[PDB]
PDB file of all heavy atoms in Angstrom:
ATOM      1  N   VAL A   1     109.315 189.913 245.560  1.00 37.05           N
ATOM      2  CA  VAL A   1     110.192 188.830 246.205  1.00 37.05           C
ATOM      3  C   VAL A   1     110.579 187.881 245.078  1.00 37.05           C
ATOM      4  O   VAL A   1     110.146 188.080 243.940  1.00 37.05           O
ATOM      5  CB  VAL A   1     109.538 188.121 247.356  1.00 37.05           C
ATOM      6  CG1 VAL A   1     108.440 187.004 246.810  1.00 37.05           C
ATOM      7  CG2 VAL A   1     110.467 187.461 248.230  1.00 37.05           C
ATOM      8  N   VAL A   2     111.330 186.850 245.307  1.00 40.04           N
ATOM      9  CA  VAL A   2     111.803 185.984 244.473  1.00 40.04           C
ATOM     10  C   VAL A   2     110.617 184.943 244.020  1.00 40.04           C
ATOM     11  O   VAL A   2     110.019 184.510 244.971  1.00 40.04           O
ATOM     12  CB  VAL A   2     112.971 185.162 244.800  1.00 40.04           C
ATOM     13  CG1 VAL A   2     113.207 183.935 243.862  1.00 40.04           C
ATOM     14  CG2 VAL A   2     114.181 185.996 245.020  1.00 40.04           C
ATOM     15  N   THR A   3     110.343 184.741 242.712  1.00 40.57           N
ATOM     16  CA  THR A   3     109.315 183.872 242.381  1.00 40.57           C
ATOM     17  C   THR A   3     109.954 182.689 241.548  1.00 40.57           C
ATOM     18  O   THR A   3     111.184 182.563 241.298  1.00 40.57           O
ATOM     19  CB  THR A   3     108.211 184.693 241.388  1.00 40.57           C
ATOM     20  OG1 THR A   3     107.149 183.773 241.107  1.00 40.57           O
ATOM     21  CG2 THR A   3     108.883 185.221 240.217  1.00 40.57           C
ATOM     22  N   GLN A   4     109.047 181.766 241.001  1.00 40.29           N
ATOM     23  CA  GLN A   4     109.442 180.579 240.327  1.00 40.29           C
ATOM     24  C   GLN A   4     108.365 180.220 239.328  1.00 40.29           C
ATOM     25  O   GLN A   4     107.313 179.698 239.705  1.00 40.29           O
ATOM     26  CB  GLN A   4     109.843 179.478 241.259  1.00 40.29           C
ATOM     27  CG  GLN A   4     110.218 178.218 240.502  1.00 40.29           C
ATOM     28  CD  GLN A   4     110.864 177.146 241.560  1.00 40.29           C
ATOM     29  OE1 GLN A   4     111.229 177.686 242.618  1.00 40.29           O
ATOM     30  NE2 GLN A   4     110.952 175.993 241.254  1.00 40.29           N
ATOM     31  N   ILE A   5     108.537 180.696 238.000  1.00 38.73           N
ATOM     32  CA  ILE A   5     107.563 180.348 236.987  1.00 38.73           C
ATOM     33  C   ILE A   5     108.050 179.433 235.944  1.00 38.73           C
ATOM     34  O   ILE A   5     109.208 178.890 235.884  1.00 38.73           O
ATOM     35  CB  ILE A   5     107.267 181.723 236.455  1.00 38.73           C
ATOM     36  CG1 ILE A   5     108.397 182.364 235.545  1.00 38.73           C
ATOM     37  CG2 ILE A   5     106.801 182.785 237.400  1.00 38.73           C
ATOM     38  CD1 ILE A   5     108.051 183.424 234.670  1.00 38.73           C
ATOM     39  N   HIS A   6     107.038 178.957 235.118  1.00 42.72           N
ATOM     40  CA  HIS A   6     107.383 178.259 233.938  1.00 42.72           C
ATOM     41  C   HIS A   6     106.881 178.893 232.643  1.00 42.72           C
ATOM     42  O   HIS A   6     105.619 179.123 232.559  1.00 42.72           O
ATOM     43  CB  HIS A   6     106.782 176.859 234.139  1.00 42.72           C
ATOM     44  N   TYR A   7     107.667 179.132 231.645  1.00 41.80           N
ATOM     45  CA  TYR A   7     107.456 179.916 230.391  1.00 41.80           C
ATOM     46  C   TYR A   7     107.497 178.905 229.256  1.00 41.80           C
ATOM     47  O   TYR A   7     108.075 177.920 229.296  1.00 41.80           O
ATOM     48  CB  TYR A   7     108.438 181.161 230.334  1.00 41.80           C
ATOM     49  N   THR A   8     106.959 179.489 228.210  1.00 43.51           N
ATOM     50  CA  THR A   8     107.116 178.842 226.742  1.00 43.51           C
ATOM     51  C   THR A   8     106.953 179.880 225.798  1.00 43.51           C
ATOM     52  O   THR A   8     105.765 180.279 225.543  1.00 43.51           O
ATOM     53  CB  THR A   8     106.148 177.683 226.631  1.00 43.51           C
ATOM     54  OG1 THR A   8     106.225 176.680 227.760  1.00 43.51           O
ATOM     55  CG2 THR A   8     106.460 176.792 225.384  1.00 43.51           C
ATOM     56  N   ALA A   9     107.986 180.370 225.220  1.00 41.63           N
ATOM     57  CA  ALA A   9     107.980 181.670 224.482  1.00 41.63           C
ATOM     58  C   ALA A   9     107.873 181.375 223.051  1.00 41.63           C
ATOM     59  O   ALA A   9     108.678 180.344 222.538  1.00 41.63           O
ATOM     60  CB  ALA A   9     109.150 182.590 224.834  1.00 41.63           C
ATOM     61  N   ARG A  10     107.047 182.067 222.444  1.00 41.36           N
ATOM     62  CA  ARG A  10     106.796 181.886 220.910  1.00 41.36           C
ATOM     63  C   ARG A  10     107.451 183.106 220.155  1.00 41.36           C
ATOM     64  O   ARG A  10     107.902 184.157 220.748  1.00 41.36           O
ATOM     65  CB  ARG A  10     105.395 181.718 220.583  1.00 41.36           C
ATOM     66  CG  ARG A  10     104.831 180.326 220.642  1.00 41.36           C
ATOM     67  CD  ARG A  10     104.708 179.706 221.921  1.00 41.36           C
ATOM     68  NE  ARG A  10     103.913 178.492 221.943  1.00 41.36           N
ATOM     69  CZ  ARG A  10     102.688 178.447 222.234  1.00 41.36           C
ATOM     70  NH1 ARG A  10     101.994 179.493 222.509  1.00 41.36           N
ATOM     71  NH2 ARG A  10     102.105 177.382 222.345  1.00 41.36           N
ATOM     72  N   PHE A  11     107.392 182.893 218.784  1.00 41.41           N
ATOM     73  CA  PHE A  11     107.447 183.940 217.895  1.00 41.41           C
ATOM     74  C   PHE A  11     106.116 184.575 217.593  1.00 41.41           C
ATOM     75  O   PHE A  11     105.073 184.034 218.058  1.00 41.41           O
ATOM     76  CB  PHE A  11     108.187 183.670 216.568  1.00 41.41           C
ATOM     77  CG  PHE A  11     109.585 183.823 216.680  1.00 41.41           C
ATOM     78  CD1 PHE A  11     110.475 183.306 215.716  1.00 41.41           C
ATOM     79  CD2 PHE A  11     110.225 184.583 217.726  1.00 41.41           C
ATOM     80  CE1 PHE A  11     111.885 183.593 215.636  1.00 41.41           C
ATOM     81  CE2 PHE A  11     111.607 184.822 217.721  1.00 41.41           C
ATOM     82  CZ  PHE A  11     112.370 184.269 216.765  1.00 41.41           C
ATOM     83  N   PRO A  12     105.820 185.644 216.901  1.00 44.39           N
ATOM     84  CA  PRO A  12     104.653 186.272 216.537  1.00 44.39           C
ATOM     85  C   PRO A  12     103.657 185.157 216.015  1.00 44.39           C
ATOM     86  O   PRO A  12     102.367 185.320 216.404  1.00 44.39           O
ATOM     87  CB  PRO A  12     104.899 187.397 215.730  1.00 44.39           C
ATOM     88  CG  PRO A  12     106.446 187.353 215.320  1.00 44.39           C
ATOM     89  CD  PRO A  12     106.979 186.652 216.573  1.00 44.39           C
ATOM     90  N   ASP A  13     104.102 184.444 214.921  1.00 43.92           N
ATOM     91  CA  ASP A  13     103.143 183.659 214.305  1.00 43.92           C
ATOM     92  C   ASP A  13     103.110 182.117 214.895  1.00 43.92           C
ATOM     93  O   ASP A  13     102.219 181.794 215.536  1.00 43.92           O
ATOM     94  CB  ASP A  13     103.483 183.533 212.819  1.00 43.92           C
ATOM     95  CG  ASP A  13     102.306 182.795 212.122  1.00 43.92           C
ATOM     96  OD1 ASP A  13     102.190 181.600 212.079  1.00 43.92           O
ATOM     97  OD2 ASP A  13     101.534 183.464 211.308  1.00 43.92           O
ATOM     98  N   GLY A  14     104.201 181.512 214.750  1.00 42.77           N
ATOM     99  CA  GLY A  14     104.180 180.049 215.101  1.00 42.77           C
ATOM    100  C   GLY A  14     105.321 179.555 215.915  1.00 42.77           C
ATOM    101  O   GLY A  14     105.209 178.663 216.706  1.00 42.77           O
ATOM    102  N   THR A  15     106.512 180.132 215.646  1.00 43.76           N
ATOM    103  CA  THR A  15     107.795 179.579 216.120  1.00 43.76           C
ATOM    104  C   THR A  15     108.005 179.593 217.594  1.00 43.76           C
ATOM    105  O   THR A  15     107.459 180.428 218.228  1.00 43.76           O
ATOM    106  CB  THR A  15     109.018 180.185 215.467  1.00 43.76           C
ATOM    107  OG1 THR A  15     108.696 180.147 214.005  1.00 43.76           O
ATOM    108  CG2 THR A  15     110.203 179.274 215.481  1.00 43.76           C
ATOM    109  N   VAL A  16     108.611 178.614 218.109  1.00 44.99           N
ATOM    110  CA  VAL A  16     109.033 178.463 219.613  1.00 44.99           C
ATOM    111  C   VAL A  16     110.569 178.463 219.672  1.00 44.99           C
ATOM    112  O   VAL A  16     111.218 177.779 218.985  1.00 44.99           O
ATOM    113  CB  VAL A  16     108.384 177.336 220.217  1.00 44.99           C
ATOM    114  CG1 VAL A  16     109.148 176.931 221.591  1.00 44.99           C
ATOM    115  CG2 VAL A  16     106.944 177.434 220.393  1.00 44.99           C
ATOM    116  N   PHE A  17     111.235 179.439 220.487  1.00 44.69           N
ATOM    117  CA  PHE A  17     112.600 179.457 220.528  1.00 44.69           C
ATOM    118  C   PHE A  17     113.073 179.183 221.967  1.00 44.69           C
ATOM    119  O   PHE A  17     114.326 178.822 222.064  1.00 44.69           O
ATOM    120  CB  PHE A  17     113.174 180.952 220.218  1.00 44.69           C
ATOM    121  CG  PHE A  17     112.565 182.015 221.024  1.00 44.69           C
ATOM    122  CD1 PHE A  17     113.132 182.340 222.300  1.00 44.69           C
ATOM    123  CD2 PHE A  17     111.498 182.784 220.583  1.00 44.69           C
ATOM    124  CE1 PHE A  17     112.480 183.270 223.007  1.00 44.69           C
ATOM    125  CE2 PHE A  17     110.939 183.859 221.245  1.00 44.69           C
ATOM    126  CZ  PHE A  17     111.514 184.036 222.590  1.00 44.69           C
ATOM    127  N   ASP A  18     112.311 179.079 223.012  1.00 44.02           N
ATOM    128  CA  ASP A  18     112.775 178.511 224.205  1.00 44.02           C
ATOM    129  C   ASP A  18     111.457 178.134 225.057  1.00 44.02           C
ATOM    130  O   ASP A  18     110.411 178.607 224.785  1.00 44.02           O
ATOM    131  CB  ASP A  18     113.590 179.386 224.986  1.00 44.02           C
ATOM    132  CG  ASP A  18     112.924 180.716 225.331  1.00 44.02           C
ATOM    133  OD1 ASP A  18     111.735 180.955 224.940  1.00 44.02           O
ATOM    134  OD2 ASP A  18     113.616 181.567 226.010  1.00 44.02           O
ATOM    135  N   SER A  19     111.716 177.256 225.973  1.00 44.48           N
ATOM    136  CA  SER A  19     110.592 176.797 226.880  1.00 44.48           C
ATOM    137  C   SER A  19     111.319 176.219 228.162  1.00 44.48           C
ATOM    138  O   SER A  19     112.176 175.404 228.049  1.00 44.48           O
ATOM    139  CB  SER A  19     109.814 175.661 226.181  1.00 44.48           C
ATOM    140  OG  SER A  19     110.372 174.399 226.066  1.00 44.48           O
ATOM    141  N   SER A  20     110.825 176.757 229.297  1.00 44.46           N
ATOM    142  CA  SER A  20     111.341 176.311 230.578  1.00 44.46           C
ATOM    143  C   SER A  20     111.328 174.772 230.753  1.00 44.46           C
ATOM    144  O   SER A  20     112.313 174.187 231.375  1.00 44.46           O
ATOM    145  CB  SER A  20     110.683 176.929 231.715  1.00 44.46           C
ATOM    146  OG  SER A  20     110.764 178.292 231.724  1.00 44.46           O
ATOM    147  N   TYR A  21     110.558 174.075 230.097  1.00 44.63           N
ATOM    148  CA  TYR A  21     110.376 172.667 230.209  1.00 44.63           C
ATOM    149  C   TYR A  21     111.592 172.011 229.387  1.00 44.63           C
ATOM    150  O   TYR A  21     111.884 170.833 229.635  1.00 44.63           O
ATOM    151  CB  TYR A  21     109.069 172.249 229.488  1.00 44.63           C
ATOM    152  CG  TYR A  21     107.842 172.706 230.249  1.00 44.63           C
ATOM    153  CD1 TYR A  21     106.691 172.948 229.640  1.00 44.63           C
ATOM    154  CD2 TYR A  21     107.862 172.947 231.642  1.00 44.63           C
ATOM    155  CE1 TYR A  21     105.503 173.393 230.314  1.00 44.63           C
ATOM    156  CE2 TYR A  21     106.816 173.534 232.386  1.00 44.63           C
ATOM    157  CZ  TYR A  21     105.581 173.640 231.678  1.00 44.63           C
ATOM    158  OH  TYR A  21     104.507 174.096 232.319  1.00 44.63           O
ATOM    159  N   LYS A  22     112.133 172.589 228.430  1.00 42.94           N
ATOM    160  CA  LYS A  22     113.380 172.312 227.762  1.00 42.94           C
ATOM    161  C   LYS A  22     114.611 172.226 228.603  1.00 42.94           C
ATOM    162  O   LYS A  22     115.618 171.784 228.127  1.00 42.94           O
ATOM    163  CB  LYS A  22     113.639 173.034 226.513  1.00 42.94           C
ATOM    164  CG  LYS A  22     114.246 172.408 225.461  1.00 42.94           C
ATOM    165  CD  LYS A  22     114.817 173.304 224.236  1.00 42.94           C
ATOM    166  CE  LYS A  22     116.096 174.162 224.831  1.00 42.94           C
ATOM    167  NZ  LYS A  22     116.513 175.052 223.551  1.00 42.94           N
ATOM    168  N   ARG A  23     114.455 172.404 229.931  1.00 44.61           N
ATOM    169  CA  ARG A  23     115.534 172.190 230.802  1.00 44.61           C
ATOM    170  C   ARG A  23     114.905 171.642 232.058  1.00 44.61           C
ATOM    171  O   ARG A  23     113.889 170.825 232.006  1.00 44.61           O
ATOM    172  CB  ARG A  23     116.221 173.582 231.201  1.00 44.61           C
ATOM    173  CG  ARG A  23     116.698 174.424 230.046  1.00 44.61           C
ATOM    174  CD  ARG A  23     117.473 175.578 230.568  1.00 44.61           C
ATOM    175  NE  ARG A  23     117.135 176.747 229.731  1.00 44.61           N
ATOM    176  CZ  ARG A  23     116.286 177.701 230.174  1.00 44.61           C
ATOM    177  NH1 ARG A  23     115.552 177.500 231.291  1.00 44.61           N
ATOM    178  NH2 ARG A  23     116.011 178.774 229.495  1.00 44.61           N
ATOM    179  N   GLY A  24     115.556 171.721 233.222  1.00 41.69           N
ATOM    180  CA  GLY A  24     114.992 170.951 234.435  1.00 41.69           C
ATOM    181  C   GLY A  24     114.142 171.940 235.114  1.00 41.69           C
ATOM    182  O   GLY A  24     113.134 172.284 234.614  1.00 41.69           O
ATOM    183  N   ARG A  25     114.445 172.246 236.503  1.00 42.31           N
ATOM    184  CA  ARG A  25     113.545 173.126 237.161  1.00 42.31           C
ATOM    185  C   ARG A  25     113.249 174.376 236.500  1.00 42.31           C
ATOM    186  O   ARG A  25     114.214 175.019 235.894  1.00 42.31           O
ATOM    187  CB  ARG A  25     114.322 173.446 238.534  1.00 42.31           C
ATOM    188  N   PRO A  26     111.932 174.757 236.413  1.00 43.69           N
ATOM    189  CA  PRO A  26     111.669 176.028 235.701  1.00 43.69           C
ATOM    190  C   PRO A  26     112.317 177.179 236.512  1.00 43.69           C
ATOM    191  O   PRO A  26     112.316 177.263 237.690  1.00 43.69           O
ATOM    192  CB  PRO A  26     110.129 176.098 235.723  1.00 43.69           C
ATOM    193  CG  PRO A  26     109.721 174.612 235.971  1.00 43.69           C
ATOM    194  CD  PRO A  26     110.836 174.000 236.739  1.00 43.69           C
ATOM    195  N   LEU A  27     112.770 178.248 235.586  1.00 43.14           N
ATOM    196  CA  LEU A  27     113.702 179.253 236.151  1.00 43.14           C
ATOM    197  C   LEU A  27     113.015 180.045 237.126  1.00 43.14           C
ATOM    198  O   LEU A  27     111.773 180.166 237.279  1.00 43.14           O
ATOM    199  CB  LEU A  27     114.232 180.056 234.997  1.00 43.14           C
ATOM    200  CG  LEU A  27     113.266 181.195 234.547  1.00 43.14           C
ATOM    201  CD1 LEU A  27     114.077 182.167 233.738  1.00 43.14           C
ATOM    202  CD2 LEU A  27     112.128 180.570 233.585  1.00 43.14           C
ATOM    203  N   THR A  28     113.810 180.664 238.075  1.00 41.44           N
ATOM    204  CA  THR A  28     113.380 181.521 239.097  1.00 41.44           C
ATOM    205  C   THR A  28     113.974 182.849 238.977  1.00 41.44           C
ATOM    206  O   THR A  28     115.010 183.176 238.521  1.00 41.44           O
ATOM    207  CB  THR A  28     113.937 181.066 240.494  1.00 41.44           C
ATOM    208  OG1 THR A  28     115.259 181.236 240.587  1.00 41.44           O
ATOM    209  CG2 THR A  28     113.676 179.431 240.582  1.00 41.44           C
ATOM    210  N   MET A  29     113.019 183.941 239.065  1.00 45.59           N
ATOM    211  CA  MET A  29     113.349 185.294 238.844  1.00 45.59           C
ATOM    212  C   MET A  29     112.872 186.286 239.957  1.00 45.59           C
ATOM    213  O   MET A  29     112.318 185.628 240.979  1.00 45.59           O
ATOM    214  CB  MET A  29     112.784 185.718 237.469  1.00 45.59           C
ATOM    215  CG  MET A  29     111.180 185.886 237.479  1.00 45.59           C
ATOM    216  SD  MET A  29     110.388 186.072 235.902  1.00 45.59           S
ATOM    217  CE  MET A  29     108.737 186.452 236.302  1.00 45.59           C
ATOM    218  N   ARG A  30     112.898 187.512 239.777  1.00 44.25           N
ATOM    219  CA  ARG A  30     112.450 188.550 240.791  1.00 44.25           C
ATOM    220  C   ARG A  30     111.319 189.314 240.255  1.00 44.25           C
ATOM    221  O   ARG A  30     111.525 190.011 239.141  1.00 44.25           O
ATOM    222  CB  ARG A  30     113.656 189.450 241.080  1.00 44.25           C
ATOM    223  CG  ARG A  30     114.228 189.095 242.490  1.00 44.25           C
ATOM    224  CD  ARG A  30     115.230 190.139 242.767  1.00 44.25           C
ATOM    225  NE  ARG A  30     116.284 189.550 243.698  1.00 44.25           N
ATOM    226  CZ  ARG A  30     116.057 189.477 245.206  1.00 44.25           C
ATOM    227  NH1 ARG A  30     114.847 189.823 245.650  1.00 44.25           N
ATOM    228  NH2 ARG A  30     117.044 189.035 245.864  1.00 44.25           N
ATOM    229  N   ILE A  31     110.160 189.183 240.697  1.00 46.66           N
ATOM    230  CA  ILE A  31     108.910 189.952 240.326  1.00 46.66           C
ATOM    231  C   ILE A  31     108.794 191.150 241.197  1.00 46.66           C
ATOM    232  O   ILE A  31     108.307 190.941 242.364  1.00 46.66           O
ATOM    233  CB  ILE A  31     107.677 189.058 240.327  1.00 46.66           C
ATOM    234  N   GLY A  32     109.194 192.304 240.885  1.00 44.31           N
ATOM    235  CA  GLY A  32     108.973 193.539 241.647  1.00 44.31           C
ATOM    236  C   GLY A  32     110.123 194.540 241.549  1.00 44.31           C
ATOM    237  O   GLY A  32     109.895 195.703 241.731  1.00 44.31           O
ATOM    238  N   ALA A  33     111.293 193.974 241.277  1.00 43.71           N
ATOM    239  CA  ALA A  33     112.398 194.895 240.940  1.00 43.71           C
ATOM    240  C   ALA A  33     112.759 194.540 239.513  1.00 43.71           C
ATOM    241  O   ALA A  33     112.991 193.517 239.058  1.00 43.71           O
ATOM    242  CB  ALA A  33     113.636 194.617 241.937  1.00 43.71           C
ATOM    243  N   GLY A  34     113.149 195.610 238.819  1.00 45.83           N
ATOM    244  CA  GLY A  34     113.404 195.562 237.306  1.00 45.83           C
ATOM    245  C   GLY A  34     114.610 194.639 236.995  1.00 45.83           C
ATOM    246  O   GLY A  34     115.850 195.060 237.068  1.00 45.83           O
ATOM    247  N   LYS A  35     114.350 193.395 236.714  1.00 44.62           N
ATOM    248  CA  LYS A  35     115.388 192.401 236.331  1.00 44.62           C
ATOM    249  C   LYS A  35     114.967 191.578 235.001  1.00 44.62           C
ATOM    250  O   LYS A  35     115.667 190.613 234.731  1.00 44.62           O
ATOM    251  CB  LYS A  35     115.735 191.524 237.472  1.00 44.62           C
ATOM    252  CG  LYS A  35     116.472 192.140 238.649  1.00 44.62           C
ATOM    253  CD  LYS A  35     118.029 192.203 238.186  1.00 44.62           C
ATOM    254  CE  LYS A  35     118.457 193.558 237.744  1.00 44.62           C
ATOM    255  NZ  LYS A  35     119.837 193.886 237.630  1.00 44.62           N
ATOM    256  N   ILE A  36     113.711 191.888 234.487  1.00 44.53           N
ATOM    257  CA  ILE A  36     113.152 191.009 233.537  1.00 44.53           C
ATOM    258  C   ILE A  36     112.549 192.016 232.524  1.00 44.53           C
ATOM    259  O   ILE A  36     112.473 193.260 232.696  1.00 44.53           O
ATOM    260  CB  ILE A  36     112.145 190.118 234.052  1.00 44.53           C
ATOM    261  CG1 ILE A  36     111.152 190.730 234.988  1.00 44.53           C
ATOM    262  CG2 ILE A  36     112.897 189.000 234.943  1.00 44.53           C
ATOM    263  CD1 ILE A  36     109.996 189.972 235.480  1.00 44.53           C
ATOM    264  N   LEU A  37     112.081 191.452 231.376  1.00 44.32           N
ATOM    265  CA  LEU A  37     111.405 192.229 230.423  1.00 44.32           C
ATOM    266  C   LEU A  37     110.138 193.042 230.989  1.00 44.32           C
ATOM    267  O   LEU A  37     109.363 192.393 231.888  1.00 44.32           O
ATOM    268  CB  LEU A  37     110.680 191.294 229.327  1.00 44.32           C
ATOM    269  CG  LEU A  37     111.674 190.683 228.161  1.00 44.32           C
ATOM    270  CD1 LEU A  37     112.046 192.049 227.283  1.00 44.32           C
ATOM    271  CD2 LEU A  37     112.824 190.036 228.563  1.00 44.32           C
ATOM    272  N   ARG A  38     110.092 194.295 230.761  1.00 40.69           N
ATOM    273  CA  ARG A  38     109.090 195.174 231.247  1.00 40.69           C
ATOM    274  C   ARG A  38     107.561 194.595 231.004  1.00 40.69           C
ATOM    275  O   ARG A  38     106.682 194.654 231.837  1.00 40.69           O
ATOM    276  CB  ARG A  38     109.095 196.617 230.811  1.00 40.69           C
ATOM    277  CG  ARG A  38     110.173 197.435 231.528  1.00 40.69           C
ATOM    278  CD  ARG A  38     109.997 198.904 231.309  1.00 40.69           C
ATOM    279  NE  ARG A  38     110.585 199.330 229.997  1.00 40.69           N
ATOM    280  CZ  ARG A  38     109.900 199.916 229.009  1.00 40.69           C
ATOM    281  NH1 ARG A  38     108.664 200.191 229.150  1.00 40.69           N
ATOM    282  NH2 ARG A  38     110.611 200.251 227.875  1.00 40.69           N
ATOM    283  N   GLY A  39     107.488 193.924 229.875  1.00 36.58           N
ATOM    284  CA  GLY A  39     106.139 193.285 229.594  1.00 36.58           C
ATOM    285  C   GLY A  39     105.705 192.351 230.559  1.00 36.58           C
ATOM    286  O   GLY A  39     104.610 192.378 231.086  1.00 36.58           O
ATOM    287  N   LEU A  40     106.660 191.411 230.972  1.00 35.08           N
ATOM    288  CA  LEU A  40     106.458 190.356 231.969  1.00 35.08           C
ATOM    289  C   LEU A  40     106.104 191.051 233.365  1.00 35.08           C
ATOM    290  O   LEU A  40     105.052 190.805 233.874  1.00 35.08           O
ATOM    291  CB  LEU A  40     107.573 189.478 232.082  1.00 35.08           C
ATOM    292  CG  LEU A  40     107.940 188.765 230.810  1.00 35.08           C
ATOM    293  CD1 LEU A  40     108.671 187.493 231.048  1.00 35.08           C
ATOM    294  CD2 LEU A  40     106.760 188.270 229.876  1.00 35.08           C
ATOM    295  N   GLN A  41     107.136 191.831 233.813  1.00 35.84           N
ATOM    296  CA  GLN A  41     106.825 192.525 235.093  1.00 35.84           C
ATOM    297  C   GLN A  41     105.629 193.202 235.095  1.00 35.84           C
ATOM    298  O   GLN A  41     104.996 193.450 236.275  1.00 35.84           O
ATOM    299  CB  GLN A  41     108.130 193.397 235.359  1.00 35.84           C
ATOM    300  CG  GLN A  41     108.113 193.878 236.787  1.00 35.84           C
ATOM    301  CD  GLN A  41     109.255 194.845 237.105  1.00 35.84           C
ATOM    302  OE1 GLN A  41     110.401 194.665 237.677  1.00 35.84           O
ATOM    303  NE2 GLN A  41     108.980 196.063 236.698  1.00 35.84           N
ATOM    304  N   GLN A  42     105.008 193.599 233.994  1.00 33.64           N
ATOM    305  CA  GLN A  42     103.635 194.317 234.058  1.00 33.64           C
ATOM    306  C   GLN A  42     102.716 193.237 233.992  1.00 33.64           C
ATOM    307  O   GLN A  42     101.462 193.413 234.486  1.00 33.64           O
ATOM    308  CB  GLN A  42     103.628 195.225 232.784  1.00 33.64           C
ATOM    309  N   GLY A  43     102.815 192.120 233.294  1.00 31.70           N
ATOM    310  CA  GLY A  43     101.846 191.010 233.235  1.00 31.70           C
ATOM    311  C   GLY A  43     101.958 189.793 234.177  1.00 31.70           C
ATOM    312  O   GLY A  43     101.137 188.864 233.957  1.00 31.70           O
ATOM    313  N   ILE A  44     102.854 189.969 235.195  1.00 33.81           N
ATOM    314  CA  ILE A  44     102.928 188.754 236.150  1.00 33.81           C
ATOM    315  C   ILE A  44     102.695 189.397 237.602  1.00 33.81           C
ATOM    316  O   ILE A  44     101.915 189.025 238.387  1.00 33.81           O
ATOM    317  CB  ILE A  44     104.205 188.155 235.994  1.00 33.81           C
ATOM    318  CG1 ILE A  44     104.151 187.103 234.986  1.00 33.81           C
ATOM    319  CG2 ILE A  44     104.631 187.546 237.258  1.00 33.81           C
ATOM    320  CD1 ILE A  44     105.495 186.324 234.625  1.00 33.81           C
ATOM    321  N   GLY A  45     103.471 190.436 237.876  1.00 35.24           N
ATOM    322  CA  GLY A  45     103.211 191.094 239.154  1.00 35.24           C
ATOM    323  C   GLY A  45     102.024 191.963 239.054  1.00 35.24           C
ATOM    324  O   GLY A  45     101.589 192.384 240.157  1.00 35.24           O
ATOM    325  N   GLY A  46     101.409 192.227 238.090  1.00 36.37           N
ATOM    326  CA  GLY A  46     100.324 193.068 237.755  1.00 36.37           C
ATOM    327  C   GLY A  46     100.695 194.557 237.366  1.00 36.37           C
ATOM    328  O   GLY A  46     101.155 195.267 238.143  1.00 36.37           O
ATOM    329  N   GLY A  47     100.299 194.878 236.073  1.00 37.25           N
ATOM    330  CA  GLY A  47     100.563 196.285 235.706  1.00 37.25           C
ATOM    331  C   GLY A  47      99.289 197.074 235.872  1.00 37.25           C
ATOM    332  O   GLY A  47      98.246 196.791 236.416  1.00 37.25           O
ATOM    333  N   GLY A  48      99.416 198.372 235.543  1.00 36.36           N
ATOM    334  CA  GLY A  48      98.431 199.382 235.593  1.00 36.36           C
ATOM    335  C   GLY A  48      97.175 199.021 234.877  1.00 36.36           C
ATOM    336  O   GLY A  48      97.200 198.967 233.591  1.00 36.36           O
TER     337      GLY A  48
END
């Protein structure tokens, strides 16, 4: 179903290129149907 998360994404070592806090309401996505990075959909809805 539709979820509503808050993220803060880095680069491998130190850099930050986006953060949901850098805007208003933290973004809302779909956890369960492929609409996002496979890594996330595996690490938020629960992977194998």
